[PDB]
Design a protein around this ligand. Structure first.
Ligand SMILES: Nc1ncnc2c1ncn2[C@H]1C[C@H](O)[C@@H](COP(=O)(O)OP(=O)(O)OP(=O)(O)O)O1
Ligand SMILES: Nc1ncnc2c1ncn2[C@H]1C[C@H](O)[C@@H](COP(=O)(O)OP(=O)(O)OP(=O)(O)O)O1
Ligand SMILES: [Mg+2]
Length: 616
């Protein structure tokens, strides 16, 4: 009955593409799960097809729910739980979060290295929905009937499919189904019966927890070593953090009996989970929140803290009736007051050169052989581009197919940008401006939040890799031979980016990337950046701190929309740098400096640029 509800909410809308291909959605999607049921040899799909189908009690009859382990009682419970989980989560396209008059063509979420590139209103033919169903069906046929494996098939085919073919629909059908699923699996963990649902009690009783966790002291976790620490360490030190993070999230999910579908987003080392508000959950988090802080202390004392708060909410606090934004307000407040009170250094060195051949990590007991690096509750075991995955959960890298992974192993797909090139260093720090304001008052429901939250991570977990290996702007470096950015990434996640490389590509790249960010957000968000330049061997910690000081400069600017490149206090706009510093003004220049306002600034730097393009 838990799984039934997991996949039930997951598959309730499955016939949208099936009706939108001409094979309602409740009548079509159901044949689909019956066809698939009588075409693979698992009737489970036959019983699940009923969630789409919704006479009732005699269609639950015709199928004999007890051939699994399911009382006709249990089955009606999940049919209503899921019904209203669909209502809580609240030949056309899926419009964009940012611009609601541009829209994309249904593309796949794992074909071509890309899946964006939308355009003015193009409304989708049946032929399109017919090759989609051609796939989905195959991957449905070959998948295990279990969330961890069913989620990424839906993620894969339905990301760029509209959950309701209303116009300006920002919510993809995959963010609908997950939320529907997230919410169902928790009602059920929160003991809603059909009696409660009908009475509208899963809609005013505060039956859910909105669990939220957010890391602090990351800057001082990731950046704190001196000479001892190559790019091989900084990357795996950054990787170990995601792993701490995953280890908290997967443990929360272990112990509250949930799915990855409940993970609204987990971006930046900041996470949101939807959960049953019960007292054995609250008393189960208290023990995660407490065990994991104890552990982050004993192993880093105060350098790294993870604050986890939770705020019980009602079903109508997923939507607006502005109630979601409020719950998040008290939870962000709650969250805020929750902070302010060498063998690892070496296990991470092995990792940073394994990193180029790594395909995942198995997640196991800390006392399990293979373990390279341990998190609060679990050990991790690098799954290598040679060997065989080895965990109860396997955090698989950059891809939504499990492939050569064992069954008894929750497939956990996780995206990370790692472009990396296999007289100074060029260091970028970039952070999307005021973004935690866009999330409260632009997205003020739980699905839009997940919707929006998922495109950002996409941009910083994937798209960013493509400006690195497919760069266009090059006014300093020059077009010449089509070559990628001479760079590595240390972190690209949340809304924060830290890239090292060739002094010049980095300057161009913060720009080109801000550029994409500009297009990809259609002007709707901004980024400020530090860029600094450094000799060779220097306290990474100090390259952090100084480039941080630059962005802090760029950030203390009014309107917050530029870069503070030159360590000097003379920042410019993304296209004030490009238009006037570079496209206009950029021994004689050497003496110019020794001699001694909007233009004097843009001249000041242009010369600094000119210089830097030539020394040696
Ligand atoms: N996994 C990672 N690997 C490498 N660098 C990271 C990683 N995650 C985050 N960062 C960076 C990007 C963010 O700007 C920064 C967040 O800083 P943090 O140490 O949390 O203090 P802060 O002053 O920015 O605010 P707060 O402590 O309240 O979150 O850490
Ligand atoms: N991929 C994502 N999904 C969901 N939320 C995200 C994502 N990335 C970032 N966030 C949210 C969570 C954080 O509270 C916030 C981080 O933004 P950050 O740049 O640190 O501060 P801010 O943008 O809110 O204001 P400012 O940058 O001006 O201090 O954005
Ligand atoms: Mg940030």
């Amino acid at each position: 009955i838990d799984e039934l509800t997991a996949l039930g909410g997951l598959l309730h809308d499955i016939g949208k593409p099936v009706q939108r291909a001409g094979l309602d959605h409740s009548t079509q999607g159901a044949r689909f799960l019956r066809d698939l049921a009588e075409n693979t040899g698992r009737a489970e799909y036959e019983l699940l097809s009923l969630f789409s189908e919704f006479l009732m009690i005699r269609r639950i009859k015709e199928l004999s729910p007890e051939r699994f382990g399911l009382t006709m009682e249990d089955v009606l419970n999940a049919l209503w739980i899921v019904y209203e989980a669909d209502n809580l989560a609240s030949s056309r396209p899926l419009y964009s979060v940012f611009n609601p008059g541009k829209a994309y063509p249904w593309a796949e979420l794992d074909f071509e290295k890309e899946l964006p590139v939308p355009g003015d209103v193009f409304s989708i033919r049946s032929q399109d929905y017919r090759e989609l169903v051609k796939r989905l069906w195959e991957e449905l046929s070959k998948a295990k009937l279990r969330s961890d494996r069913l989620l990424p098939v839906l993620e894969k085919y339905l990301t760029f499919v509209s959950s309701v073919t209303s116009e300006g629909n920002i919510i993809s059908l995959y963010d609908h189904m997950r939320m529907t699923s997230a919410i169902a699996l928790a009602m059920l963990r929160a003991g809603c019966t059909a009696e409660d649902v009908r009475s509208g009690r899963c809609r005013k009783e505060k039956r859910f927890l909105l669990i939220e966790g957010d890391f602090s002291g990351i800057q001082d976790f990731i950046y704190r070593v001196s000479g001892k620490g190559t790019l091989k360490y900084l990357r795996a030190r950054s990787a170990y953090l995601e792993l701490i993070g995953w280890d908290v999230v997967l443990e929360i999910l272990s112990r509250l009996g949930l799915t990855r579908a409940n993970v609204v987003f987990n971006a930046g080392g900041h996470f949101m989970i939807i959960a049953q508000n019960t007292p054995d959950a609250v008393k189960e988090l208290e023990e995660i929140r407490a065990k994991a802080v104890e552990w982050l202390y004993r192993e880093f004392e105060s350098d790294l803290y993870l604050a986890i708060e939770w705020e019980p909410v009602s079903g109508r606090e997923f939507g607006r009736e502005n109630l979601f934004a409020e719950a998040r307000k008290r939870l962000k407040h709650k969250l805020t007051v929750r902070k302010l009170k060498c063998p690892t250094c070496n296990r991470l060195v092995s990792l940073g050169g394994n990193l180029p051949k790594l395909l995942g990590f198995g997640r196991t007991a800390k006392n399990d052989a293979g373990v390279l690096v341990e998190g609060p509750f679990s050990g991790f075991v690098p799954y290598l581009q040679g060997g065989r995955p080895v965990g109860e959960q396997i955090l698989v890298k950059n891809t939504l197919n499990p492939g050569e992974i064992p069954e008894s192993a929750q497939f956990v797909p996780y995206f990370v940008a790692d472009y990396f090139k296999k007289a100074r260093l060029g260091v970028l720090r970039l952070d999307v401006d005021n973004l935690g304001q866009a999330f409260t008052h632009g997205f003020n429901t739980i699905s839009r939040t997940a919707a929006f939250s998922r495109m950002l991570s996409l941009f910083f977990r994937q798209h960013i890799n493509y400006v690195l290996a497919r760069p266009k702007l090059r006014p300093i470096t020059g077009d010449d031979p089509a070559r990628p950015r001479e760079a590595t990434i240390i972190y690209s996640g949340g809304d924060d980016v830290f890239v090292v490389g060739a002094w010049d590509d980095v300057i161009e790249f913060g720009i080109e990337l801000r550029e994409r960010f500009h297009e990809f957000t259609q002007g709707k968000l901004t980024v400020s950046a530090g860029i600094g330049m450094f000799p060779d061997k220097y306290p990474i910690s100090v390259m952090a701190r100084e480039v941080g000081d630059l962005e802090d400069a760029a950030k203390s600017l009014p309107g917050k929309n530029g870069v503070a490149l030159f360590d000097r206090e003379f920042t410019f706009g993304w296209d004030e740098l490009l238009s006037k510093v570079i496209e206009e003004k950029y021994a004689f220049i050497y003496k110019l400096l020794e001699l001694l306002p909007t233009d004097a600034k843009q001249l000041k730097t242009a010369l600094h640029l000119y210089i830097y393009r030539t020394r040696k």
